Amino acid sequence: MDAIKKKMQMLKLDKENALDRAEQAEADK
Amino acid sequence: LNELQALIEAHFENRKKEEEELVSLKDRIERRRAERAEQQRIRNEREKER
Amino acid sequence: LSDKLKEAETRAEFAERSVTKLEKSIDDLEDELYAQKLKYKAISEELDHALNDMTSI
Structure with missing residues:
Protein backbone atom coordinates (compact mmCIF):
# COMPACT_ATOMS: atom_id res chain seq x y z
CA MET A 1 0.00 0.00 0.00
CA ASP A 2 2.61 2.41 -1.26
CA ALA A 3 -0.10 4.44 -2.85
CA ILE A 4 -1.01 5.57 0.63
CA LYS A 5 2.36 5.73 2.09
CA LYS A 6 2.55 8.45 -0.55
CA LYS A 7 -0.98 9.81 0.00
CA MET A 8 -0.25 9.82 3.70
CA GLN A 9 2.75 11.92 3.13
CA ALA A 27 1.55 32.09 18.40
CA ASP A 28 1.28 35.45 16.62
CA LYS A 29 -1.19 36.72 19.25
CA LEU B 1 1.93 12.69 -8.46
CA ASN B 2 0.96 11.33 -11.87
CA GLU B 3 2.87 8.27 -10.85
CA LEU B 4 0.48 7.44 -8.08
CA GLN B 5 -2.25 7.50 -10.62
CA ALA B 6 -0.20 5.54 -13.10
CA LEU B 7 0.51 2.93 -10.44
CA ILE B 8 -2.90 2.76 -8.86
CA GLU B 9 -4.34 1.95 -12.30
CA ALA B 10 -1.40 0.01 -13.68
CA HIS B 11 -1.41 -2.29 -10.72
CA PHE B 12 -5.09 -2.95 -10.97
CA GLU B 13 -5.78 -2.91 -14.67
CA ASN B 14 -2.74 -4.74 -15.87
CA ARG B 15 -3.08 -7.41 -13.29
CA LYS B 16 -6.76 -7.94 -13.12
CA LYS B 17 -6.92 -8.33 -16.85
CA GLU B 18 -3.84 -10.50 -17.37
CA GLU B 19 -4.30 -12.50 -14.21
CA GLU B 20 -7.99 -13.24 -14.41
CA GLU B 21 -7.45 -14.27 -18.01
CA LEU B 22 -4.76 -16.70 -16.90
CA VAL B 23 -7.14 -18.09 -14.36
CA SER B 24 -9.80 -18.92 -16.93
CA LEU B 25 -7.42 -19.85 -19.74
CA LYS B 26 -5.68 -22.37 -17.59
CA ASP B 27 -8.97 -23.50 -16.09
CA ARG B 28 -9.87 -24.72 -19.56
CA ILE B 29 -6.46 -26.35 -20.07
CA GLU B 30 -6.89 -28.04 -16.71
CA ARG B 31 -10.38 -29.15 -17.57
CA ARG B 32 -9.02 -30.69 -20.79
CA ARG B 33 -6.26 -32.43 -18.82
CA ALA B 34 -9.00 -33.65 -16.42
CA GLU B 35 -10.77 -34.95 -19.52
CA ARG B 36 -7.56 -36.76 -20.39
CA ALA B 37 -7.74 -38.33 -16.93
CA GLU B 38 -11.30 -39.41 -17.73
CA GLN B 39 -10.14 -40.75 -21.07
CA GLN B 40 -7.44 -42.75 -19.32
CA ARG B 41 -10.13 -44.11 -17.01
CA ILE B 42 -12.10 -44.99 -20.15
CA ARG B 43 -9.01 -46.52 -21.75
CA ASN B 44 -8.41 -48.68 -18.68
CA GLU B 45 -12.04 -49.80 -18.66
CA ARG B 46 -11.97 -50.58 -22.36
CA GLU B 47 -8.79 -52.61 -22.09
CA LYS B 48 -10.34 -54.63 -19.29
CA GLU B 49 -13.58 -55.12 -21.20
CA ARG B 50 -11.74 -56.34 -24.30
CA LEU C 1 8.50 -66.58 -16.77
CA SER C 2 5.49 -67.34 -14.64
CA ASP C 3 7.29 -65.67 -11.81
CA LYS C 4 8.73 -63.04 -14.10
CA LEU C 5 5.15 -62.53 -15.23
CA LYS C 6 3.78 -62.44 -11.73
CA GLU C 7 6.58 -60.04 -10.89
CA ALA C 8 6.02 -58.08 -14.09
CA GLU C 9 2.35 -58.31 -13.35
CA THR C 10 3.12 -57.13 -9.86
CA ARG C 11 5.07 -54.36 -11.54
CA ALA C 12 2.26 -53.80 -14.01
CA GLU C 13 -0.23 -53.90 -11.22
CA PHE C 14 2.15 -51.87 -9.16
CA ALA C 15 2.39 -49.41 -11.87
CA GLU C 16 -1.39 -49.55 -12.35
CA ARG C 17 -1.80 -48.92 -8.62
CA SER C 18 1.04 -46.41 -8.50
CA VAL C 19 -0.52 -44.78 -11.49
CA THR C 20 -3.86 -45.02 -9.67
CA LYS C 21 -2.33 -43.43 -6.58
CA LEU C 22 -0.82 -40.82 -8.84
CA GLU C 23 -4.02 -40.55 -10.86
CA LYS C 24 -5.46 -39.61 -7.51
CA SER C 25 -2.49 -37.45 -6.55
CA ILE C 26 -2.34 -35.82 -9.94
CA ASP C 27 -5.98 -35.01 -9.64
CA ASP C 28 -5.41 -33.89 -6.10
CA LEU C 29 -2.61 -31.69 -7.33
CA GLU C 30 -4.73 -30.64 -10.28
CA ASP C 31 -7.49 -29.72 -7.84
CA GLU C 32 -5.18 -28.34 -5.17
CA LEU C 33 -3.21 -26.31 -7.63
CA TYR C 34 -6.52 -25.27 -9.12
CA ALA C 35 -8.01 -24.49 -5.74
CA GLN C 36 -4.96 -22.71 -4.56
CA LYS C 37 -4.82 -20.57 -7.67
CA LEU C 38 -8.55 -20.14 -7.74
CA LYS C 39 -8.55 -19.00 -4.20
CA TYR C 40 -5.11 -17.49 -4.04
CA LYS C 41 -4.75 -15.34 -7.03
CA ALA C 42 -8.46 -14.82 -7.00
CA ILE C 43 -8.31 -13.64 -3.38
CA SER C 44 -4.95 -11.96 -3.22
CA GLU C 45 -5.26 -10.39 -6.65
CA GLU C 46 -8.70 -9.33 -5.46
CA LEU C 47 -6.98 -7.98 -2.38
CA ASP C 48 -4.74 -5.97 -4.79
CA HIS C 49 -7.92 -4.85 -6.56
CA ALA C 50 -9.13 -3.92 -3.18
CA LEU C 51 -5.72 -2.09 -2.85
CA ASN C 52 -6.84 0.00 -5.79
CA ASP C 53 -9.75 1.04 -3.58
CA MET C 54 -8.25 0.39 -0.12
CA THR C 55 -5.49 2.85 -0.66
CA SER C 56 -7.72 5.39 -2.28
CA ILE C 57 -8.77 8.37 -0.12
Missing part, protein backbone atom coordinates in the same frame (compact mmCIF):
# COMPACT_ATOMS: atom_id res chain seq x y z
CA MET A 10 0.80 14.31 0.99
CA LEU A 11 -1.93 14.71 3.55
CA LYS A 12 0.64 14.81 6.28
CA LEU A 13 2.22 17.74 4.50
CA ASP A 14 -1.13 19.36 3.97
CA LYS A 15 -1.98 19.10 7.63
CA GLU A 16 1.47 19.85 8.82
CA ASN A 17 1.34 23.03 6.83
CA ALA A 18 -2.18 23.85 8.08
CA LEU A 19 -0.97 22.96 11.58
CA ASP A 20 2.14 25.02 11.23
CA ARG A 21 -0.28 27.80 10.41
CA ALA A 22 -2.61 26.89 13.30
CA GLU A 23 0.30 27.09 15.66
CA GLN A 24 1.63 30.30 14.12
CA ALA A 25 -1.77 31.86 13.98
CA GLU A 26 -2.15 31.29 17.68
